[PDB]
Coordinates of C-alpha atoms in Angstrom, one line a residue:
Chain A
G4 CA -9.1 -32.3 6.6
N5 CA -7.5 -31.5 9.9
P6 CA -5.9 -28.2 10.4
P7 CA -6.4 -26.3 13.7
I8 CA -9.3 -23.9 14.1
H9 CA -9.5 -20.9 16.5
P10 CA -10.6 -21.9 20.0
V11 CA -13.7 -19.7 19.9
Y12 CA -15.0 -21.7 16.9
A13 CA -14.1 -25.0 18.6
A14 CA -16.1 -23.9 21.7
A15 CA -19.1 -22.7 19.7
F16 CA -19.3 -26.1 17.8
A17 CA -19.2 -28.2 20.9
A18 CA -22.2 -26.5 22.3
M19 CA -24.0 -27.2 19.0
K20 CA -23.2 -30.9 18.9
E21 CA -26.0 -31.6 21.4
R22 CA -28.8 -30.4 19.0
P23 CA -31.1 -32.6 16.7
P24 CA -30.9 -32.2 13.0
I25 CA -32.6 -29.1 11.3
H26 CA -35.5 -30.7 9.5
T27 CA -36.8 -31.7 13.0
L28 CA -37.4 -28.2 14.4
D29 CA -40.4 -25.8 14.1
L30 CA -39.4 -22.9 11.8
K31 CA -40.1 -20.6 14.7
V32 CA -36.7 -21.4 15.9
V33 CA -36.3 -18.2 14.0
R34 CA -37.4 -16.4 17.2
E35 CA -34.9 -18.1 19.6
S36 CA -33.1 -18.9 16.5
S37 CA -30.8 -16.1 17.5
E38 CA -32.9 -13.1 17.5
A39 CA -32.9 -14.0 21.2
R40 CA -29.6 -15.7 21.5
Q41 CA -27.8 -12.8 19.7
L42 CA -29.5 -10.2 22.0
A43 CA -28.1 -12.3 25.0
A44 CA -24.6 -11.9 23.5
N45 CA -24.3 -8.4 25.2
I46 CA -21.5 -7.4 22.7
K47 CA -20.4 -3.9 22.1
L48 CA -22.2 -2.1 19.2
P49 CA -21.5 1.4 17.7
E50 CA -24.3 4.0 17.7
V51 CA -26.3 4.3 14.6
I52 CA -29.4 6.0 13.1
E53 CA -31.8 3.2 11.9
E54 CA -35.2 3.5 9.9
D55 CA -37.7 0.9 8.5
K56 CA -39.6 1.4 5.3
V57 CA -42.3 -0.5 3.2
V58 CA -42.3 0.2 -0.5
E59 CA -43.4 -0.9 -4.1
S60 CA -41.1 -1.5 -7.0
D61 CA -41.1 -3.4 -10.3
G62 CA -44.2 -5.1 -9.3
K63 CA -43.3 -6.3 -5.9
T64 CA -43.7 -5.1 -2.3
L65 CA -40.6 -4.8 -0.2
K66 CA -39.5 -4.4 3.4
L67 CA -36.1 -2.4 3.9
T68 CA -34.0 -1.3 6.7
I69 CA -31.9 1.8 6.2
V70 CA -28.8 2.3 8.5
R71 CA -26.6 5.4 8.6
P72 CA -23.8 6.8 10.9
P73 CA -24.6 9.6 13.4
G74 CA -24.0 13.2 12.3
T75 CA -24.3 12.4 8.6
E76 CA -27.9 12.9 7.9
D77 CA -27.2 16.0 5.9
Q78 CA -24.2 14.6 4.1
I79 CA -24.4 12.7 0.9
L80 CA -23.1 9.2 1.2
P81 CA -22.2 6.1 -1.0
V82 CA -24.6 3.2 -0.6
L83 CA -24.1 -0.6 0.3
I84 CA -26.7 -3.3 -0.4
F85 CA -26.5 -5.9 2.3
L86 CA -27.9 -9.4 1.8
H87 CA -27.9 -11.7 4.9
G88 CA -27.1 -15.4 5.3
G89 CA -28.9 -18.2 7.0
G90 CA -29.3 -20.9 4.4
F91 CA -32.2 -19.2 2.7
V92 CA -34.2 -20.3 5.7
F93 CA -33.2 -18.0 8.7
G94 CA -31.9 -14.6 9.3
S95 CA -33.0 -11.0 9.9
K96 CA -31.7 -7.7 10.9
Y97 CA -31.4 -8.9 14.6
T98 CA -29.2 -11.9 13.8
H99 CA -26.7 -9.9 11.6
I100 CA -26.7 -6.7 13.7
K101 CA -22.9 -6.7 14.5
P102 CA -21.4 -6.9 11.0
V103 CA -24.0 -4.5 9.5
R104 CA -23.4 -1.9 12.2
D105 CA -19.6 -2.3 11.9
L106 CA -19.5 -1.9 8.1
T107 CA -21.7 1.1 8.2
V108 CA -19.8 3.3 10.6
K109 CA -16.3 2.2 9.5
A110 CA -16.8 2.6 5.8
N111 CA -19.0 5.7 6.5
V112 CA -22.0 4.7 4.2
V113 CA -25.8 4.1 3.9
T114 CA -26.6 0.5 4.3
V115 CA -29.8 -0.9 2.8
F116 CA -30.7 -4.1 4.4
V117 CA -33.1 -6.1 2.2
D118 CA -35.5 -8.3 4.2
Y119 CA -36.1 -10.8 1.4
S120 CA -38.6 -13.6 1.3
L121 CA -37.4 -16.8 3.1
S122 CA -37.5 -20.5 2.1
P123 CA -39.4 -22.8 2.0
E124 CA -42.4 -20.5 2.0
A125 CA -40.8 -18.9 -1.0
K126 CA -38.5 -20.6 -3.6
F127 CA -36.0 -19.7 -6.3
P128 CA -36.0 -17.2 -7.8
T129 CA -38.2 -14.9 -5.8
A130 CA -35.4 -13.4 -3.5
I131 CA -33.2 -12.6 -6.5
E132 CA -36.1 -10.7 -8.1
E133 CA -36.9 -8.8 -5.0
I134 CA -33.2 -7.7 -4.6
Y135 CA -33.2 -6.5 -8.2
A136 CA -36.4 -4.5 -7.5
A137 CA -34.9 -3.0 -4.3
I138 CA -31.9 -1.8 -6.3
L139 CA -34.3 -0.1 -8.8
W140 CA -35.9 1.6 -5.9
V141 CA -32.8 3.0 -4.3
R142 CA -31.8 4.6 -7.7
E143 CA -35.2 6.2 -7.9
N144 CA -35.2 7.9 -4.4
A145 CA -31.6 8.8 -3.9
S146 CA -32.4 12.4 -3.3
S147 CA -34.7 11.4 -0.4
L148 CA -32.2 9.0 0.9
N149 CA -29.3 11.5 0.7
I150 CA -27.0 9.0 -1.3
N151 CA -24.8 9.0 -4.4
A152 CA -26.7 6.3 -6.2
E153 CA -23.9 5.7 -8.7
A154 CA -21.5 4.6 -5.9
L155 CA -23.2 1.3 -5.2
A156 CA -22.0 -2.1 -3.9
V157 CA -23.7 -5.4 -3.0
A158 CA -22.3 -7.7 -0.2
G159 CA -23.4 -10.7 1.7
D160 CA -22.5 -13.9 3.8
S161 CA -23.2 -17.6 2.9
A162 CA -26.5 -17.7 1.1
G163 CA -26.4 -13.8 0.9
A164 CA -23.1 -14.2 -0.9
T165 CA -24.8 -16.5 -3.3
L166 CA -27.6 -13.8 -3.9
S167 CA -25.0 -11.0 -4.4
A168 CA -23.4 -13.1 -7.1
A169 CA -26.6 -14.0 -9.0
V170 CA -28.3 -10.7 -8.8
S171 CA -25.1 -9.3 -10.4
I172 CA -25.7 -11.5 -13.5
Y173 CA -29.6 -11.0 -13.5
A174 CA -29.1 -7.2 -13.6
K175 CA -26.8 -7.5 -16.5
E176 CA -29.3 -9.6 -18.5
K177 CA -31.9 -6.9 -17.9
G178 CA -29.8 -4.1 -19.5
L179 CA -28.5 -2.7 -16.1
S180 CA -24.9 -3.7 -16.4
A181 CA -23.3 -0.5 -15.0
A182 CA -25.5 -0.2 -11.9
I183 CA -23.3 -2.3 -9.5
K184 CA -19.8 -1.1 -9.0
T185 CA -18.5 -4.1 -6.9
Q186 CA -19.7 -7.5 -5.4
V187 CA -18.4 -8.7 -2.1
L188 CA -18.8 -12.4 -1.6
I189 CA -18.2 -14.0 1.9
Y190 CA -18.1 -17.9 1.7
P191 CA -20.7 -18.3 -1.1
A192 CA -22.4 -21.7 -2.1
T193 CA -22.0 -22.5 -5.9
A194 CA -22.2 -26.2 -6.8
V195 CA -24.7 -28.4 -8.5
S196 CA -23.1 -31.3 -6.8
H197 CA -20.9 -30.7 -3.7
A198 CA -19.4 -34.3 -3.3
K199 CA -17.2 -33.5 -6.4
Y200 CA -14.9 -31.3 -4.1
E201 CA -12.3 -32.6 -1.5
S202 CA -13.5 -30.1 1.3
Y203 CA -16.9 -31.7 1.3
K204 CA -15.4 -34.9 2.3
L205 CA -13.0 -33.4 4.8
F206 CA -15.4 -31.2 6.8
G207 CA -18.9 -32.6 6.0
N208 CA -19.2 -35.5 8.5
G209 CA -21.0 -33.5 11.2
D210 CA -17.9 -32.6 13.4
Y211 CA -17.9 -29.0 11.9
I212 CA -20.6 -26.3 12.1
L213 CA -22.0 -26.7 8.5
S214 CA -22.5 -30.5 7.8
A215 CA -23.3 -32.4 4.5
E216 CA -26.6 -33.2 6.3
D217 CA -27.4 -29.5 6.9
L218 CA -26.7 -28.7 3.3
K219 CA -29.2 -31.3 1.9
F220 CA -32.0 -29.7 4.2
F221 CA -31.3 -26.1 2.8
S222 CA -31.2 -27.1 -0.9
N223 CA -34.5 -28.9 -0.6
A224 CA -36.0 -25.9 1.2
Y225 CA -34.7 -23.4 -1.5
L226 CA -35.0 -25.2 -4.9
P227 CA -38.3 -26.0 -6.6
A228 CA -36.7 -29.1 -8.3
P229 CA -33.4 -30.9 -8.0
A230 CA -30.4 -28.8 -9.2
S231 CA -29.3 -31.3 -11.8
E232 CA -32.8 -31.1 -13.4
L233 CA -33.0 -27.3 -12.8
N234 CA -29.9 -26.6 -14.9
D235 CA -30.0 -22.9 -14.1
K236 CA -26.7 -20.8 -13.3
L237 CA -28.7 -18.3 -11.2
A238 CA -29.5 -21.1 -8.9
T239 CA -26.2 -23.0 -9.0
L240 CA -23.5 -20.5 -10.0
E241 CA -21.1 -23.2 -10.8
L242 CA -22.9 -23.6 -14.2
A243 CA -22.0 -20.1 -15.4
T244 CA -20.4 -19.9 -18.8
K245 CA -17.5 -17.6 -19.7
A246 CA -20.1 -15.6 -21.6
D247 CA -22.4 -15.4 -18.7
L248 CA -19.6 -13.9 -16.5
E249 CA -18.0 -11.4 -19.0
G250 CA -18.5 -7.7 -18.0
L251 CA -19.4 -8.4 -14.4
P252 CA -18.3 -5.9 -11.8
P253 CA -15.0 -6.2 -9.8
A254 CA -15.2 -9.0 -7.1
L255 CA -13.8 -9.5 -3.6
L256 CA -14.2 -13.2 -2.4
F257 CA -13.5 -14.8 1.0
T258 CA -13.3 -18.4 1.6
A259 CA -12.9 -20.3 4.9
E260 CA -10.1 -23.0 5.4
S261 CA -12.4 -25.5 7.4
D262 CA -15.6 -25.4 5.3
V263 CA -17.3 -27.8 2.9
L264 CA -18.0 -25.0 0.6
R265 CA -14.4 -23.9 0.4
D266 CA -13.1 -25.3 -2.8
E267 CA -16.3 -24.5 -4.9
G268 CA -16.0 -20.9 -3.7
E269 CA -12.4 -20.9 -4.9
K270 CA -13.5 -22.4 -8.2
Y271 CA -15.9 -19.6 -8.8
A272 CA -13.0 -17.0 -8.3
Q273 CA -11.2 -18.8 -10.9
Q274 CA -14.1 -18.7 -13.3
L275 CA -14.6 -15.0 -12.9
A276 CA -10.9 -14.4 -13.7
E277 CA -11.1 -16.5 -16.8
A278 CA -13.9 -14.3 -18.1
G279 CA -11.7 -11.2 -17.6
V280 CA -13.3 -9.9 -14.4
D281 CA -11.1 -8.2 -11.8
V282 CA -11.0 -10.6 -8.8
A283 CA -9.2 -10.5 -5.3
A284 CA -9.8 -13.9 -3.7
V285 CA -8.2 -15.2 -0.4
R286 CA -8.5 -18.3 1.8
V287 CA -8.8 -17.4 5.5
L288 CA -6.6 -19.7 7.8
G289 CA -8.1 -21.0 11.0
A290 CA -11.8 -20.2 10.3
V291 CA -15.0 -22.2 9.9
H292 CA -18.1 -21.5 7.8
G293 CA -20.4 -18.5 9.0
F294 CA -17.7 -16.8 11.1
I295 CA -18.7 -13.2 10.4
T296 CA -21.8 -13.7 12.7
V297 CA -19.8 -15.1 15.7
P298 CA -20.2 -12.7 18.7
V299 CA -16.8 -13.2 20.3
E300 CA -14.2 -11.2 18.4
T301 CA -11.3 -13.2 16.8
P302 CA -8.3 -12.0 14.7
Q303 CA -10.0 -13.2 11.6
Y304 CA -13.2 -11.4 12.3
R305 CA -11.3 -8.1 12.8
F306 CA -9.1 -8.7 9.5
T307 CA -12.1 -9.5 7.4
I308 CA -14.1 -6.4 8.5
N309 CA -11.1 -4.0 8.0
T310 CA -10.2 -5.5 4.6
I311 CA -13.7 -5.2 3.2
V312 CA -13.9 -1.6 4.4
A313 CA -10.6 -0.7 2.5
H314 CA -11.9 -2.4 -0.7
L315 CA -15.2 -0.5 -0.5
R316 CA -13.5 2.8 0.1
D317 CA -11.0 2.1 -2.8
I318 CA -13.9 1.4 -5.3
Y319 CA -16.1 4.4 -4.0
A320 CA -13.2 6.8 -4.5
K321 CA -13.4 6.3 -8.3
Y322 CA -16.9 7.9 -8.4
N323 CA -16.7 11.0 -6.3
Chain B
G4 CA 0.0 -28.4 -8.9
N5 CA -2.0 -26.7 -11.6
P6 CA -4.4 -23.9 -10.6
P7 CA -4.5 -20.9 -12.9
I8 CA -2.2 -17.8 -12.4
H9 CA -2.8 -14.3 -13.5
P10 CA -1.7 -13.6 -17.2
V11 CA 0.6 -11.0 -15.9
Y12 CA 2.5 -13.5 -13.7
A13 CA 2.8 -16.0 -16.5
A14 CA 4.3 -13.2 -18.7
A15 CA 6.8 -12.3 -16.0
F16 CA 8.0 -15.9 -15.6
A17 CA 8.7 -16.4 -19.2
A18 CA 10.7 -13.2 -19.4
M19 CA 12.8 -14.2 -16.3
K20 CA 13.1 -18.0 -17.4
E21 CA 14.7 -17.0 -20.7
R22 CA 17.5 -15.0 -19.1
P23 CA 20.7 -16.7 -18.0
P24 CA 20.5 -18.8 -14.7
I25 CA 21.7 -17.5 -11.3
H26 CA 24.7 -19.6 -10.3
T27 CA 26.2 -18.7 -13.7
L28 CA 26.5 -14.9 -13.0
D29 CA 28.9 -12.3 -11.7
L30 CA 27.2 -10.9 -8.5
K31 CA 27.7 -7.4 -10.1
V32 CA 24.6 -8.7 -11.8
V33 CA 23.3 -6.4 -8.9
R34 CA 23.5 -3.3 -11.2
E35 CA 21.2 -4.8 -14.0
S36 CA 19.2 -6.9 -11.6
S37 CA 16.2 -4.5 -11.4
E38 CA 18.1 -1.4 -10.5
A39 CA 18.3 -0.8 -14.3
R40 CA 15.5 -3.3 -15.3
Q41 CA 13.2 -1.4 -12.8
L42 CA 14.2 2.2 -13.6
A43 CA 13.5 1.0 -17.1
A44 CA 10.0 -0.1 -16.3
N45 CA 9.3 3.7 -15.7
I46 CA 6.1 3.1 -13.9
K47 CA 4.2 5.9 -12.1
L48 CA 5.3 6.6 -8.6
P49 CA 3.9 8.9 -6.0
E50 CA 5.8 11.9 -4.7
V51 CA 7.9 11.4 -1.6
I52 CA 10.7 13.0 0.5
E53 CA 13.7 10.8 0.7
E54 CA 17.0 11.0 2.7
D55 CA 20.0 8.7 3.2
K56 CA 22.1 8.4 6.5
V57 CA 25.1 6.5 7.8
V58 CA 25.3 5.9 11.5
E59 CA 26.7 3.9 14.4
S60 CA 24.6 1.7 16.7
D61 CA 25.2 -1.2 19.1
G62 CA 28.8 -1.8 17.8
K63 CA 27.8 -1.6 14.1
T64 CA 27.8 0.8 11.2
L65 CA 24.6 1.0 9.3
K66 CA 23.3 2.5 6.0
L67 CA 19.6 3.7 6.2
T68 CA 17.1 5.4 3.9
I69 CA 14.3 7.5 5.3
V70 CA 11.1 8.1 3.4
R71 CA 8.2 10.4 4.3
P72 CA 5.0 11.9 2.5
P73 CA 5.1 15.5 1.3
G74 CA 3.6 18.1 3.7
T75 CA 4.1 16.0 6.8
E76 CA 7.6 17.1 7.9
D77 CA 6.3 19.0 11.1
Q78 CA 3.7 16.3 12.0
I79 CA 4.8 13.5 14.3
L80 CA 4.2 10.1 12.5
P81 CA 4.2 6.4 13.3
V82 CA 7.2 4.5 11.9
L83 CA 7.5 1.3 9.6
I84 CA 10.8 -0.7 9.5
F85 CA 11.0 -2.2 6.0
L86 CA 13.2 -5.3 5.1
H87 CA 13.5 -6.1 1.3
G88 CA 13.7 -9.5 -0.2
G89 CA 16.0 -10.9 -3.0
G90 CA 17.1 -14.3 -1.6
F91 CA 19.5 -12.6 0.9
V92 CA 21.7 -12.1 -2.2
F93 CA 20.1 -9.2 -4.3
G94 CA 17.9 -6.2 -3.6
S95 CA 18.1 -2.5 -2.9
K96 CA 16.0 0.7 -2.6
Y97 CA 15.8 0.7 -6.4
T98 CA 14.3 -2.8 -6.7
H99 CA 11.7 -2.3 -4.0
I100 CA 10.8 1.3 -4.8
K101 CA 7.3 0.7 -5.8
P102 CA 5.9 -1.1 -2.7
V103 CA 7.9 1.1 -0.3
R104 CA 6.6 4.4 -1.8
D105 CA 3.1 3.1 -2.0
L106 CA 2.9 1.9 1.6
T107 CA 4.6 5.3 2.9
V108 CA 2.0 7.5 1.1
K109 CA -1.1 5.5 1.6
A110 CA -0.4 4.5 5.4
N111 CA 0.9 8.1 6.1
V112 CA 4.1 6.9 7.9
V113 CA 7.9 7.3 8.0
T114 CA 9.6 4.4 6.4
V115 CA 13.0 3.4 7.5
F116 CA 14.6 1.2 4.8
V117 CA 17.5 -0.9 6.3
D118 CA 20.1 -1.6 3.7
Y119 CA 21.5 -4.8 5.4
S120 CA 24.6 -6.7 4.4
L121 CA 24.1 -9.2 1.5
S122 CA 25.1 -12.8 1.1
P123 CA 27.4 -14.6 0.4
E124 CA 29.8 -11.9 1.5
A125 CA 28.0 -11.8 4.9
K126 CA 26.2 -14.8 6.4
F127 CA 23.7 -15.7 9.2
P128 CA 23.2 -14.1 11.6
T129 CA 24.9 -10.7 10.6
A130 CA 21.8 -9.1 8.9
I131 CA 19.6 -10.0 11.9
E132 CA 22.0 -8.2 14.3
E133 CA 22.2 -5.2 12.0
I134 CA 18.4 -4.8 11.9
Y135 CA 18.2 -5.0 15.7
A136 CA 20.7 -2.2 16.0
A137 CA 18.7 -0.1 13.6
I138 CA 15.7 -0.6 15.7
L139 CA 17.7 0.7 18.7
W140 CA 18.8 3.7 16.6
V141 CA 15.4 4.8 15.6
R142 CA 14.3 4.5 19.2
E143 CA 17.3 6.9 20.2
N144 CA 16.5 9.6 17.7
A145 CA 12.7 9.9 17.5
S146 CA 12.7 13.6 18.1
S147 CA 15.1 14.3 15.3
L148 CA 13.3 12.1 12.9
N149 CA 9.9 13.4 14.1
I150 CA 8.2 10.0 14.9
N151 CA 6.3 8.3 17.8
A152 CA 8.7 5.5 18.4
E153 CA 6.3 3.6 20.3
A154 CA 4.1 3.1 17.2
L155 CA 6.6 0.9 15.4
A156 CA 6.1 -2.0 13.0
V157 CA 8.3 -4.4 10.9
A158 CA 7.4 -5.7 7.4
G159 CA 9.1 -7.5 4.6
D160 CA 8.8 -9.8 1.4
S161 CA 10.4 -13.3 1.1
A162 CA 13.7 -13.2 2.6
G163 CA 12.8 -9.8 4.1
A164 CA 9.8 -11.5 5.7
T165 CA 12.0 -14.2 7.2
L166 CA 14.2 -11.5 8.7
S167 CA 11.1 -9.6 10.1
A168 CA 10.0 -12.8 12.1
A169 CA 13.5 -13.7 13.3
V170 CA 14.4 -10.2 14.6
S171 CA 11.0 -10.2 16.5
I172 CA 12.3 -13.2 18.4
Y173 CA 15.9 -11.9 18.8
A174 CA 14.6 -8.6 20.2
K175 CA 12.6 -10.5 22.7
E176 CA 15.6 -12.7 23.8
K177 CA 17.4 -9.3 24.3
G178 CA 14.8 -8.0 26.7
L179 CA 13.4 -5.6 24.2
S180 CA 9.9 -7.4 24.0
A181 CA 7.7 -4.3 23.9
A182 CA 9.4 -2.5 21.0
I183 CA 7.6 -4.1 18.1
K184 CA 3.8 -3.6 18.0
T185 CA 3.2 -5.8 14.9
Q186 CA 4.9 -8.0 12.3
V187 CA 3.9 -8.1 8.7
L188 CA 5.1 -11.2 6.9
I189 CA 4.9 -11.6 3.0
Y190 CA 5.6 -15.2 1.8
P191 CA 8.4 -16.1 4.2
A192 CA 10.7 -19.0 4.1
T193 CA 10.9 -21.1 7.3
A194 CA 11.8 -24.8 6.7
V195 CA 14.8 -27.0 7.5
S196 CA 13.8 -29.3 4.7
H197 CA 11.3 -28.0 2.0
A198 CA 10.6 -31.4 0.4
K199 CA 8.4 -32.3 3.5
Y200 CA 5.7 -29.9 2.2
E201 CA 3.5 -30.7 -0.9
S202 CA 4.0 -27.4 -2.4
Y203 CA 7.7 -28.0 -2.9
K204 CA 6.7 -30.9 -5.2
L205 CA 3.9 -29.1 -7.0
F206 CA 5.7 -25.8 -7.9
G207 CA 9.4 -26.4 -7.6
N208 CA 10.4 -28.3 -10.9
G209 CA 11.4 -25.0 -12.8
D210 CA 8.1 -24.0 -14.3
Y211 CA 7.4 -21.4 -11.6
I212 CA 9.3 -18.3 -10.4
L213 CA 11.0 -19.9 -7.4
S214 CA 12.4 -23.5 -8.2
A215 CA 14.0 -26.0 -5.9
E216 CA 17.2 -25.3 -7.8
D217 CA 17.0 -21.5 -7.1
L218 CA 16.2 -22.2 -3.3
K219 CA 19.3 -24.3 -3.1
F220 CA 21.5 -21.6 -4.4
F221 CA 20.2 -19.0 -1.8
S222 CA 20.5 -21.4 1.2
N223 CA 24.1 -22.1 0.3
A224 CA 24.8 -18.4 0.0
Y225 CA 23.1 -17.4 3.2
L226 CA 23.9 -20.3 5.6
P227 CA 27.5 -20.9 7.1
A228 CA 26.6 -24.6 7.4
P229 CA 23.8 -27.0 6.5
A230 CA 20.4 -26.2 8.3
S231 CA 20.3 -29.7 9.9
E232 CA 23.7 -29.2 11.5
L233 CA 23.0 -25.5 12.4
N234 CA 19.8 -26.4 14.3
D235 CA 19.1 -22.7 15.0
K236 CA 15.5 -21.3 15.0
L237 CA 16.5 -17.8 14.0
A238 CA 18.0 -19.4 10.8
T239 CA 15.2 -21.7 10.1
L240 CA 11.9 -20.4 11.8
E241 CA 10.3 -23.9 11.7
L242 CA 12.4 -25.1 14.6
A243 CA 10.9 -22.5 17.0
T244 CA 9.3 -23.9 20.2
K245 CA 6.1 -22.9 21.8
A246 CA 8.2 -21.2 24.5
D247 CA 10.2 -19.3 21.8
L248 CA 7.0 -17.8 20.3
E249 CA 5.1 -16.8 23.5
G250 CA 4.6 -13.1 24.0
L251 CA 5.5 -12.2 20.3
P252 CA 3.7 -9.3 18.5
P253 CA 0.5 -9.7 16.5
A254 CA 1.0 -11.0 12.9
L255 CA -0.3 -10.5 9.5
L256 CA 0.9 -13.2 7.1
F257 CA 0.5 -13.6 3.3
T258 CA 1.0 -16.8 1.4
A259 CA 0.9 -17.3 -2.4
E260 CA -1.1 -20.0 -3.9
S261 CA 1.5 -21.1 -6.6
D262 CA 4.7 -21.0 -4.6
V263 CA 7.0 -23.7 -3.1
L264 CA 7.1 -21.9 0.2
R265 CA 3.2 -21.9 0.6
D266 CA 2.7 -24.8 3.0
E267 CA 5.5 -24.0 5.3
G268 CA 4.4 -20.3 5.5
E269 CA 0.9 -21.6 6.4
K270 CA 2.5 -23.9 9.1
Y271 CA 4.3 -21.0 10.8
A272 CA 1.0 -19.3 11.1
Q273 CA -0.4 -22.3 12.9
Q274 CA 2.7 -22.3 15.3
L275 CA 2.2 -18.6 16.2
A276 CA -1.6 -19.1 16.9
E277 CA -0.8 -22.3 19.0
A278 CA 1.5 -20.1 21.2
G279 CA -1.3 -17.6 21.8
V280 CA -0.2 -15.0 19.4
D281 CA -2.8 -12.9 17.6
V282 CA -2.7 -14.0 13.9
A283 CA -4.4 -13.2 10.6
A284 CA -3.3 -15.2 7.8
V285 CA -4.5 -15.7 4.1
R286 CA -3.7 -17.6 1.0
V287 CA -3.7 -15.3 -2.1
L288 CA -5.3 -17.1 -5.1
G289 CA -3.9 -16.8 -8.6
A290 CA -0.6 -15.4 -7.3
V291 CA 3.0 -16.6 -7.5
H292 CA 6.1 -16.1 -5.3
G293 CA 7.6 -12.5 -5.3
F294 CA 4.5 -10.8 -6.6
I295 CA 4.8 -7.6 -4.5
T296 CA 7.8 -6.5 -6.7
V297 CA 6.0 -7.0 -10.2
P298 CA 5.7 -3.6 -11.9
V299 CA 2.4 -4.2 -13.8
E300 CA -0.5 -3.9 -11.4
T301 CA -2.9 -6.8 -10.8
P302 CA -6.0 -7.1 -8.7
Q303 CA -3.7 -9.0 -6.1
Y304 CA -1.1 -6.3 -5.9
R305 CA -3.8 -3.7 -5.1
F306 CA -5.6 -5.8 -2.5
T307 CA -2.3 -6.6 -0.8
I308 CA -1.2 -3.1 -0.4
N309 CA -4.6 -1.8 0.8
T310 CA -5.1 -4.6 3.2
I311 CA -1.6 -4.1 4.8
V312 CA -2.4 -0.3 5.1
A313 CA -5.7 -1.1 6.8
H314 CA -3.9 -3.5 9.3
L315 CA -1.1 -1.0 10.1
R316 CA -3.6 1.8 10.8
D317 CA -5.7 -0.5 13.0
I318 CA -2.6 -1.3 15.2
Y319 CA -1.2 2.3 15.3
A320 CA -4.4 3.8 16.4
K321 CA -4.2 2.1 19.8
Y322 CA -1.1 3.9 20.6
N323 CA -2.0 7.5 19.9

């Protein structure tokens, strides 16, 4: 309830302690709401070739961003489906620009960024259905995207990690069980009830970046009913049966040491292994929730990027 | 005291637990202790070029094994100093043949395996002094070994991890503080008293691979006096001051979830970060003490090898 955190994370929270709770803000705090604050960061970014597209698939209209390294336009690449965090309420290609551009050039892939519908304007399960539809589209247009559509991965942070895990189950229930070759899950949310876990108590009182109070706001925005009445594993992953999880694609899971969602994340890792799924799971020491989008580099930001890149290249090599 | 472990590790424990105990064996249990029982595993290994040498350095005589990938003999490579585990009492190039050959070929390096003096025939601090002398020898003969001696790292498991960390401090106190560019530490032992940490209680009662009874055997074998009377940081890393740890090289530390040494390993990570050292540290879920030398591959063995390879190549690149 009290180990040390890296000074960069401590400095970032202290600046945040001044602000009002979230339910008392105009949701066009999306604009400042670090599109602006992240541009002000001034951080180093690697050169990239970026392109936006608007398409139709499986009965939906989608917006996508396609990101590729320089000098690879004529080369056929593996593909990464990236799902951003933000509590289901915020986030865009501007807020997550640093980890997306880093993964793309270091792994040497084509990244498809899915700009899914945000809550509370949309609710469960619209985004899961959009992400399934985008996956179908990428398989249909591999030749025009210059990718090997069989070498495919899904990866995301926070709420994006929750979506990566659910669309892996959804795709299987639709008869598409061989499409996704790996799932990368960076501090996901999984629980019907969070107060069951010790980390909720230790880090949820408002002195760390993601509070028990913040969590209650995001759940109400995302869910169309209370989780206990909803009783749906695609909404709350913790409910998944051994049968639900059997045959899922190999997983890589990260958890943060000082994070209310820590223990429920580690419990889902255990659930996947019981069902026979290949799982590599680690707890990262000194880190807090959301650290992959923190602009000032730390030893754990660098470790996590490099470690994901090596896992992706290990998986992709089996399909070339 | 009760999370799940991988089925492979449970199987390995029952096979080891059925065998006669340690303090009731002739120390020429060395021939059978996974020189034969390893060979006998007959697992696939990758091709390598191996060479043994006997040399003089800093007033000592050393035995070394030098390992390199095929087709790189004329290319100048970075170098990895490797220190095997075994409680300070067992271990050789036959017991650790699998991770040494994997690291060598995947990272594309020259591995120098240091066959240090075993306990109880030798005691603290003889082995530490031998490893410093080998580091000096590697630096003297870089042109004859075909390596860039500046791009140098030290890595080890269990007791080999304890040795990696101590020789990083020893070398610094000798005025050789720029020689080691990174330390890789796989479940090390650090404590004066182990019973201060909760993981000693949870996993030390004889139902896991490294018991409190086993630990007591190795300490009495290695130490010339009790740790509390010795009061020496190079013997028990936990005693190290902030002043001792300043200016040390960047660390990668692995800890195992079901392992008596878990909490004291995680404490040493905190100590290094407090002193300003760059540290990436993780807890590996589902794993037990000693897992890097288990022959049957697990998702955790693969993750750990690939992740070390990605860290070594990150460090080496800034020196070429």
